[PDB]
């Protein structure tokens, strides 16, 4: 009826997750511990005050080794080495791996060694051994005993895969490319500074910075059919949150723009309900802050060049939207704990 | 990976090493 | 050997043009007058100091009715109605229409009525009657007596058309779509304010703002072959200058990425020399400020999905680059004055 | 009683003012009309979707010439000339003059000549015959028959005065200077463009822009004793909302940092309750979006140089905080009509 | 004579310092080595392409472990521990300590224990035994044998002191307070993230962020007479470079605004020639990118409240202006080696 | 174009009317 | 400083070139 | 205020969580 969860990496996703969880009516989870590179004070403070989310409307307190939010206390640890975490003794079933540093089964496994039973990486799994799931796309194929280390993919993949599915199941994708105009993230530098990636090294708030992404391919993990068909790039721009994907795919079954949006719109209220949102209003990025859906199709922008060439634009709150999907995945595993 | 290969291996969370797949 | 030019609208393009002109070694033009919604003082000041271009290294002075730069004096007028401008008496041959308000032959013609012999609109011509030229794409088809009202198209068209040409002349474009991640411009509001376009009404420096564009089609005016084949959208982002186009076209002659860049690279040093720049460095937008070329291909980003699906990314300094092309067009007309 | 109110200028203060109203306990006002440079469709869209405030949670619709919010319909007029407004025929008692244009006693009066019985200028009033009131400072000196045109002063004055008062009563200000690090506003150009004020002419989101201000000298209008004592400047920086003022006053009664903070805190809990907020947390500007108070003293920043040179730092949500005061001032006038 | 110099920390001040050098008349220094947390390829790319300074016009190349600029090759070391640097074996006379980490007299000394004969800290030195010098203020008190570890103080101190001096000599400062509206720097997080300082923890490009500063109190290190007289704070705002300080000093000899400006202007032309720039134009922050002087007085902003309360506003290119002073200080030490 | 049609026709350079084809 | 803006702003008080908010 | 940052920043003076520049 309930699994104990620990959060490793109390960053953007780690804190967005905790807030998405507290905001829900019912849950089969219980967040009982957090590991981070900070003290409990810093943790409580960044959770309560957020430049993007605004102040967290909740009763938040803290002490040397814990923070408390609306009656629930969570132990605060600060060990960079997962192998030293007291997961076994704290009876931790699921660990949210959101440090962005343990994305391989090998690294994530360190939590299992420490005593955790399962680890859910909030990023694309690196190397072999991890099971990737995207709610609303292949969440139905979830088996508790399949992988001790799972992944909720990347935020782009979560916005892309759900749209690509409806597009493949209705028009059949022959192939396509994709560009995501993304908000800058913590892996970029505020000012021109040293970095293993010469583009990520440039001042993020004053440049349009291109970066290679795996999101396009990653869709192939939740939609095998598309294996090797999609591809893309990323353009980071001066906004702190909310991104948008530009998907151009060569359909197999020639159609028209009105049909494409008719399909997408149908999904938003049926199959992809809660995952895909259908927007037909002249809106902008900030309007989508706090949007729970994973993909927000801007209908007025859909293009069908010559019956078979389709172009779709979908927004997504890379932090909040994605984090609702992490809560979803965690909840799934909770409802199917073995 | 002359420098960053070995360096980022010991400090994968260093400002010069973070790479978030977006 | 020389035509007298007047600048109508001393805005971003109007001032970038004047600076591009002063920066050249030789010219068949002589800028002798400027009309604007300001006084001579404001004109001299904004020309000298620029948030994007930096200080104009030149001897600039002014008085009640004129500004002087490096010995050349230019009369300063301030009449919003072109029909009242003393073009005839000031022996004005060419007028740079850069107010952004007279884009139809009808409106631009008001300068002819006022006595000017030719008008070059720094934007896509609206309605029938204007001749559109894009240096390096169809500048060879220029006839002085063809149109008294010409157009240098839009900045996107100038970056797009030159690339689409090389792509059509080498692989043959069957069709395609395009998205331009553009810097915000003066038609957008700094904060959420009233506007005939609900998206352009939103705070430009904190939003990703989509807008419909004609650039995609406009290419058909300089490359008839592509008539009705290309199409696109625009995403304005929080940067004050420099944009980048994302072109995805279905080639007719299957190829590979290395070939596509091999072609583009060839053009940069031959046919499209001075128009297209070939960049194979991990750069970002600010790096392209002050770049004279019209299209700056980022090779490392070129994609060829399944032999026939090509995706190209090209940067462009929408203000400076485009303005060099306006100077070019003006110079052409000067060298062929009838 | 329920006086009838009309809004002239449905911009930032205009729409913010409304939302403050629609969210209050009880009301002695009734907004029945809104004059703006736009159609009802635009006015409805902007009141709902906001880049700063976020989506307006309310039932909103509109028709050919009016908007309805939570059952309340308000007529939408679109005349740039106050003299031509249907104030008389619409039995309008009070006009909220928030266009930013009719701020002189002479221009505001045009609403009176059109039928309105009283006009409230949401900015400093220039000229003679205007009653300026700062809630919590001199609002008790309000008399319905004292002035037909009243002013709520500027947002900086609304932050400056409440604090200047407590510091004067308690320590008596001899002289003083101030500087406000303000968010940019709609009077500034998004990119270098013509402006009567060469500093307001510069790209707003990429510059720190100094501007003269009459907020310091205006404090004298509500605290007569300070007349000729305070002066300062303003620096607009790249943030869309929320500002902070830096006050440095020479006091007569020497004190220490803790004393200054103790009284400011005392007032925030007593006399200045609801007007001056006391903050001892290490927060940043975005944490104050939505703060109702007018002055939010940042206690850890208070400083007292050599017993008599006091420096206080106070944040203020220039759009939302100020609007609450405008709704406060309108209520005062409603509770004292005749 | 030509002393041998090594750069520890090739960041903003690091690379800016170099470019200032490579662009000077004659030199008594010779940069032979650069220690940075990166490979030579990265160090070469960042010295050339700059988001703020723009492309470095110079011949630049690099090899497996060094970079050559205009014929001059400099060795590239990559050791985070100063104790392990080849200073002794490379006959390094002076080290430019610009890592931002070894700023204590104790940490800087590690360069000495490694062989360097002298170390110049490009920031305020903490601890005992450090010689602080502000060019144009107390640089004539320089003596090679006075200190092995010297400091060029902070960029704000370099703007504050030169002005505090002229205002003290001429009017004698009794007491004073200051506030600097500074561009964000690499010590701040791009998005809300863990930091020992809760304010530096907040998203830099979307917040006005207050921080404590020892720039005001540090002025006492170069103008002993001011010790215990000046204090202030700092406010980091969303601009990548260029700052402005707001000084409010109580003077002994009452004066008027014109007098304060007349002396500041006098000095800018005489004693403070090359250090304090006098500006009477209505400019904005970006207009000062590249200004060599340390203090750029904005005369139209000068104010004198009641004869003895003076307020001066001075701009400073915190990266480039400060670097010129670091190159100035290194030259002084080179011209006085032994 | 209820309002902006007629309005933008007389003040085509008004803040609410500018549309630059980008 | 009104060789133009005086009249222009008098006649077009809401023009982008004329707006002055007392921040 | 050093229940963590004291040691951490002592051992990792260049960490993103430790940088303090005297602006
Ligand atoms: N838009 C987004 O931010 C987004 C969306 C989807 C997925 N992700 C993914 O989530 C991960 C984290 O991203 P983020 O945006 O939250 O970044 P972030 O930097 O804010 O979060 C990382 C957090 O982990 C902590 N941390 C780092 N190393 C640690 C260690 N060894 N032990 C304990 N804590 C440690 C940091 O102190 C920080 O609090 C990445 O893999 C990223 O790609 C991010
Ligand atoms: N990136 C770009 O800025 C860019 C690139 C290519 C083309 N363009 C095009 O150029 C035109 C102007 O763009 P901009 O960026 O220079 O904008 P801008 O607003 O800076 O320039 C317009 C100028 O015209 C003046 N003006 C307006 N109405 C006038 C009138 N009736 N009489 C005299 N002067 C008048 C204004 O005062 C201003 O100085 C537009 O059509 C635009 O689409 C812009
Ligand atoms: N931080 C703040 O925004 C702030 C705080 C306090 C006071 N104010 C004051 O409020 C006033 C407006 O500022 P704002 O921020 O709301 O700007 P804004 O531009 O968003 O609002 C002005 C509104 O007036 C409309 N308008 C212009 N001319 C008009 C006319 N002739 N008839 C009818 N409507 C017209 C505009 O279309 C717009 O909707 C200014 O005087 C300003 O100084 C602003
Ligand atoms: N406006 C300014 O930027 C400014 C002005 C005056 C003084 N400063 C001072 O200069 C110092 C650096 O600031 P910055 O702006 O150049 O920041 P920065 O981060 O760009 O530069 C610091 C550099 O040091 C390197 N580094 C870090 N740890 C190292 C180690 N152990 N060994 C070798 N290299 C290492 C980094 O990789 C980086 O290249 C600070 O103390 C700062 O206060 C900055
Ligand atoms: Cu993503
Ligand atoms: Cu364009
Ligand atoms: Cu204000
Ligand atoms: Cu400084």
Q: How many residues does chain A have?
A: 338
For residue C233, give Cα distances in angstroms to C68, C184, C247, D263, F21. Answer: 41, 14, 11, 58, 11
Query: Cβ of E191 under 8 Å from any chain H Cβ?
Result: no
Other Cβ atoms within 10 Å of H6 Cβ, number: 12
Query: Please, which residues bridge with residue E248 across strands?
Result: E177, E311
Chain centre to alpha carbon of residue A234: 16
Cite the beta strand spans of chain D per DSSP E. Answer: 3-8, 29-35, 60-63, 66-69, 72-77, 94-97, 118-121, 130-132, 149-151, 173-183, 209-212, 230-237, 243-251, 276-279, 295-298, 303-305, 309-316
Both structure tokens of E333: 């030490």
Q: Which residue of G has its CA nearest to C38?
A: G4
Residue C73 burial (CB < 10 Å; 0-12/13-18/19+)?
A: middle
Give the span between the Cα atoms of C119 and C126, in whole angstroms.
14
**Interaxial angle between packed helices A320-335 and A155-170, expressed in degrees from 0 to 180 and rounded to the nearest 10:** 80
Same domain assignment for residues D331 and D260: no
Both structure tokens of B10: 């010991």
- Please choose, from the candidates D92, D97, D93, D122, the residue with its C-alpha nearest in 3D space to the C-alpha of residue D109: D97
Same domain assignment for residues D118 and D166: no
CB A40 within 8 A of CB A76: yes
CB A315 within 8 A of CB A246: no
C-alpha count within 13 angstroms, C-beta hemisphere, residue C55:
13
Give the span between the Cα atoms of E99 and E13, in whole angstroms.
9
Query: A96 — phi, psi (to 5°)?
Result: -90, 115
Ligand 1: does its nearest atom lie under 6 Å from the Cβ of B13? yes
Query: C64 — phi, psi (to 5°)?
Result: -35, -40
For residue C238, give Cα distances in angstroms to C188, C204, C285, E25. Answer: 11, 6, 12, 39
Query: A57 — phi, psi (to 5°)?
Result: -70, 90
**3-state secondary structure labels for all residues of A233-282:** EEEEECCCCCEEEEEEEEECCCCCHHHHHHHHHHHHHCCCECCEEEECCC
Could you give the 3-state DSSP secondary structure of residue D15? helix
Both structure tokens of E232: 């202030």
Give the span between the Cα atoms of C202 and E313, in whole angstroms.
34
The per-residue DSSP string of A9-71 comes to --SHHHHHHHHHHHT-S--SEEEEEEE-SS-HHHHHHHHH--TTT----S-EEEETTEEEETT
Instruction: Enumerate the residues of chain B whose CB falls inside 8 A of the CB of residue E38.
Output: 3-4, 16
Interface test with A, best of E192, E200, E202 (most A CBs within 10 A): E192
Greatest C-alpha distance within chain H: 26
The H-or-E segment that residue E268 falls in is: helix E257-269
Pocket test for ligand 1, best of A13, A45, A108, A116 (most atoms within 8 A of CB): A13
Pair type for strands D230-237 and C303-305: unpaired
Both structure tokens of E261: 């400006």
- The DSSP call for residue D184 is P
Chains D and F touch (3+ CB pairs under 8 A): yes
Both structure tokens of A225: 């059919």
Which CATH number do you get for residue D166?
3.30.360.10
Give the span between the Cα atoms of A310 and A247, in whole angstroms.
8
CB E215 within 8 A of CB E247: no
Question: Which residues of C contribute to the annotated binding site for NAD(+)?
Answer: 10, 12-13, 36-37, 80, 100, 122, 155, 194, 318-319
CB A98 within 8 A of CB A14: yes
Residue D93 burial (CB < 10 Å; 0-12/13-18/19+)?
A: buried
- The DSSP call for residue E132 is E
Whole-number CA gyration radius for chain C: 20
In the annotation, is A155 catalytic?
yes
Any residues with CB less than 8 A from the CB of A37 and at least 6 apart, and which?
A78, A80, B13, E194, H8, H15, H17
In chain A, breaks (C-N over 2.5 A) are found after none
- The DSSP call for residue E25 is S
Could you give the 3-state DSSP secondary structure of residue D99? coil
Give the span between the Cα atoms of B12 and H15, in whole angstroms.
12
Give the span between the Cα atoms of C76 and C86, in whole angstroms.
11
Both structure tokens of E54: 């723009």
Instruction: Enumerate the residues of chain E whose CB falls inside 8 A of the CB of residue D244.
Output: 208, 235
CB C317 within 8 A of CB C155: no
Query: Please, which residues bridge with residue D211 across strands?
Result: D234
Query: Please, which residues bridge with residue E250 across strands?
Result: E175, E309
The H-or-E segment that residue E262 falls in is: helix E257-269
Chains A and G touch (3+ CB pairs under 8 A): no
Other Cβ atoms within 10 Å of B5 Cβ, number: 10
Give the span between the Cα atoms of C15 and C103, in whole angstroms.
18
Both structure tokens of D189: 């150009």
Could you give the 3-state DSSP secondary structure of residue D252? coil
Both structure tokens of A43: 């943790």
CB A235 within 8 A of CB C180: no
Give the span between the Cα atoms of C273 and C19, in whole angstroms.
22
**Interaxial angle between packed helices C155-170 and C215-222, expressed in degrees from 0 to 180 and rounded to the nearest 10:** 60
- Contact state of C207 with A235 under an 8 Å Cβ cutoff: no
Give the span between the Cα atoms of C69 and C62, in whole angstroms.
9
Based on DSSP, count helices (H) and strands (E) in chain B, helices before strands: 1, 0
Other Cβ atoms within 10 Å of C290 Cβ, number: 18
CB E294 within 8 A of CB E159: yes
The closest ligand to the CA of E51 turns out to be: 4
Query: Cβ of E100 under 8 Å from any chain A Cβ?
Result: no
Query: A161 — phi, psi (to 5°)?
Result: -50, -45
- Please choose, from the candidates D334, D305, D302, the residue with its C-alpha nearest in 3D space to the C-alpha of residue D166: D302
Q: Could you tell me the residue range of the domain that residue C200 belongs to?
A: 154-318
Both structure tokens of A153: 């993919």
CB C131 within 8 A of CB C150: yes
Could you give the 3-state DSSP secondary structure of residue D303? strand
CB E189 within 8 A of CB E273: no
**Interaxial angle between packed helices E155-171 and E320-335, expressed in degrees from 0 to 180 and rounded to the nearest 10:** 80
Chain centre to alpha carbon of residue G23: 17
CB E329 within 8 A of CB E135: yes
Any residues with CB less than 8 A from the CB of A289 and at least 6 apart, and which?
A52, A53, A241, A242, A317, A320, D54
Same domain assignment for residues A294 and A332: no
Give the span between the Cα atoms of C297 and C316, in whole angstroms.
9
Number of domains composing chain A: 2
The per-residue DSSP string of A98-134 comes to -SSS--BHHHHHHHHHTT-SEEEESS--BSSS-EE--
Instruction: Enumerate the residues of chain A whose CB falls inside 8 A of the CB of residue D45.
Output: 282
Cite the beta strand spans of chain E per DSSP E. Answer: 3-8, 29-35, 60-63, 66-69, 72-77, 94-97, 118-121, 130-132, 149-151, 173-183, 209-212, 230-237, 243-251, 276-279, 295-298, 303-305, 309-316
C-alpha count within 13 angstroms, C-beta hemisphere, residue D63:
6
Same domain assignment for residues D31 and D129: yes
For residue E161, give Cα distances in angstroms to A235, E56, H20. Answer: 43, 31, 22
Both structure tokens of C260: 């596509």
CB C178 within 8 A of CB C312: no
Nearest 5 degrees, angle CA D32-CA D33-CA D34? 140
With b for 16 or more beta-carbon neighbours within 10 A and e for fewer, the A240-276 pattern comes to: bbbbbbbbbbbbeeebebebbbebbbbbbeeebeebb
Q: Is F16 annotated as a binding residue?
A: yes
Give the span between the Cα atoms of C188 and C197, in whole angstroms.
9
Other Cβ atoms within 10 Å of C198 Cβ, number: 17
Query: Cβ of D128 under 8 Å from any chain F Cβ?
Result: no
Give the span between the Cα atoms of E125 and C255, in whole angstroms.
61
Give the span between the Cα atoms of E76 and E38, in whole angstroms.
9
Same domain assignment for residues E163 and E145: no
Question: Which residues of A contribute to the annotated binding site?
Answer: 10, 12-13, 36-37, 80, 100, 122, 154-156, 185, 194, 213-214, 236, 318-319
For residue D86, give Cα distances in angstroms to D8, D110, F3. Answer: 12, 12, 18
Give the span between the Cα atoms of C313 and A223, in whole angstroms.
27
Chain centre to alpha carbon of residue C43: 21
Same domain assignment for residues A109 and A207: no
Query: Cβ of A41 under 8 Å from any chain H Cβ?
Result: yes
Pocket test for ligand 2, best of C98, C134, C188, C318 (most atoms within 8 A of CB): C98
Ligand 3: does its nearest atom lie under 6 Å from the Cβ of D176? no
The per-residue DSSP string of C39-91 comes to -HHHHHHHHH--TTT----S-EEEETTEEEETTEEEEEE--S-GGGS-TTTTT
Atom of ligand 1 nearest to the CA of A79: 32
Same domain assignment for residues D134 and D227: no
Instruction: Enumerate the residues of chain A whose CB falls inside 8 A of the CB of residue H17.
Output: 37-38
CB E186 within 8 A of CB H19: yes
Ligand 3: does its nearest atom lie under 6 Å from the Cβ of D13? yes
Residue E269 burial (CB < 10 Å; 0-12/13-18/19+)?
A: exposed
CB E246 within 8 A of CB E175: no
Pair type for strands E209-212 and A209-212: unpaired
Both structure tokens of C52: 């994007």
Same domain assignment for residues E50 and E140: yes
Q: How far is the CA of D322 from the centre of ligand 7 (A)?
A: 8
CB D133 within 8 A of CB D329: yes
Ligand 6 ion: Cβ-proximal residues, 5 Å cutoff: C 154-156; F 22
Other Cβ atoms within 10 Å of D173 Cβ, number: 23
Give the span between the Cα atoms of D106 and D97, in whole angstroms.
12
Same domain assignment for residues A268 and A225: yes
Ligand 2: does its nearest atom lie under 6 Å from the Cβ of C234? no
| Strands across the sheet containing C60-63 | C60-63, C66-69, C72-77, C29-35, C3-8, C94-97, C118-121, C149-151, C131-132
Which CATH number do you get for residue E122?
3.40.50.720
Same domain assignment for residues A130 and A253: no
Both structure tokens of A130: 């991890």
Any residues with CB less than 8 A from the CB of E102 and at least 6 apart, and which?
E8, E82, E108, E110, E111, E121, H13
CB D235 within 8 A of CB D209: yes
Query: Please, which residues bridge with residue E95 across strands?
Result: E6, E119
Residue C258 burial (CB < 10 Å; 0-12/13-18/19+)?
A: exposed
The minimum CA-CA distance between G14 and chain F, rounded to whole Å, is 9
List the alpha helices (DSSP H) in chain C: 12-22, 40-48, 105-113, 155-170, 215-222, 257-269, 320-335
The H-or-E segment that residue C173 falls in is: strand C173-183
For residue E279, give Cα distances in angstroms to D204, D237, E304, E315. Answer: 21, 20, 18, 10
For residue A123, give Cα distances in angstroms to A30, B20, C236, E142, E260. Answer: 22, 8, 28, 56, 60
Same domain assignment for residues D309 and D327: no
Could you give the 3-state DSSP secondary structure of residue D63? strand
- Give the residue carrying structure tokens 């814990």: A66
- The DSSP call for residue D288 is G
- The DSSP call for residue D271 is T
Other Cβ atoms within 10 Å of C59 Cβ, number: 10
Residue nearest to atom 42 of ligand 2 (CA): F20
CB A94 within 8 A of CB A121: no
Ligand 2: does its nearest atom lie under 6 Å from the Cβ of C84? no
Query: Cβ of F15 under 8 Å from any chain G Cβ?
Result: yes
Give the span between the Cα atoms of C263 and C251, in whole angstroms.
14
Chains G and C touch (3+ CB pairs under 8 A): yes
The closest ligand to the CA of E234 turns out to be: 8
Question: Which value, to the nearest 10 degrees, does the dihedral of the CA atoms of residues A153, A159, A163, A164 take?
Answer: -40
Q: How many residues does chain E have?
A: 338
Pair type for strands E29-35 and E72-77: parallel
Could you give the 3-state DSSP secondary structure of residue C202? coil
- Contact state of B19 with A193 under an 8 Å Cβ cutoff: no
Same domain assignment for residues C324 and C295: no
Give the span between the Cα atoms of E106 and E95, in whole angstroms.
15
Any residues with CB less than 8 A from the CB of E106 and at least 6 apart, and which?
E127
- Give the residue carrying structure tokens 């360190």: A110
The minimum CA-CA distance between B10 and chain A, rounded to whole Å, is 11
The per-residue DSSP string of E159-206 comes to HHHHHHHHHHHHH-EEEEEEEEEEEP-TTS-SSS---SSTTTTS-GGG
The per-residue DSSP string of C124-156 comes to --BSSS-EE--TTTTGGG--TTT-SEEE---HH
């Amino acid at each position: 009826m309930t699994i104990r969860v620990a959060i490793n990496g109390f960053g953007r996703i780690g804190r967005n997750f905790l807030r998405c969880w507290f905001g829900r009516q019912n849950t089969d989870l219980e967040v009982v511990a957090i590991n981070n590179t900070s003290d409990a004070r810093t943790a409580a403070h960044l959770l309560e005050y957020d430049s993007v989310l605004g102040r967290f409307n909740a009763d938040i307190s803290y002490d040397e080794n814990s923070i408390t939010v609306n009656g629930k206390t969570m132990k605060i640890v600060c060990d960079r080495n997962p192998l030293n975490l007291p997961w076994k003794e704290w009876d931790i079933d699921l660990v949210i791996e959101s440090t962005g540093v343990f994305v391989t089964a090998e690294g994530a496994s360190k939590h299992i060694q420490a005593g955790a039973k399962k680890v859910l990486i909030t990023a694309p799994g690196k190397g072999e051994g991890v099971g990737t799931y995207v709610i609303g796309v292949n969440d139905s194929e979830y088996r508790h005993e399949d992988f001790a280390v799972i992944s909720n993919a990347s935020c782009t993949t979560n916005c892309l895969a759900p749209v690509a599915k409806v597009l493949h199941d209705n028009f059949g994708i022959i192939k396509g490319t994709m560009t995501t105009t993304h908000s800058y993230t913590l892996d970029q530098r505020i000012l021109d500074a040293s970095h293993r990636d010469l583009r990520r090294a440039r001042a993020a708030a004053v440049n349009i910075v291109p970066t290679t992404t795996g999101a396009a391919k990653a869709v192939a993990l939740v939609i095998p059919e598309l294996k090797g068909k999609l591809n893309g790039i990323a353009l980071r721009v001066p906004t702190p949150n909310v991104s948008v994907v530009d998907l151009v795919v060569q359909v197999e079954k020639p159609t028209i723009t009105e049909q494409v949006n008719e399909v997408l719109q149908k999904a938003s209220q049926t199959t992809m309900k809660g995952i895909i949102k259908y927007s037909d209003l002249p809106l902008v990025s900030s309007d989508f802050r706090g949007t729970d859906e994973s993909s927000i199709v801007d209908s007025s922008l859909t293009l069908v060049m010559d019956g078979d060439l389709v172009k779709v634009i979908a927004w997504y709150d890379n932090e909040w939207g994605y984090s609702q999907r992490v809560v979803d995945l965690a909840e799934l595993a909770a409802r199917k704990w073995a | 990976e002359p420098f960053f290969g070995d360096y980022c291996s010991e400090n994968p969370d260093a400002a010069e090493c973070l790479i978030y797949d977006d």
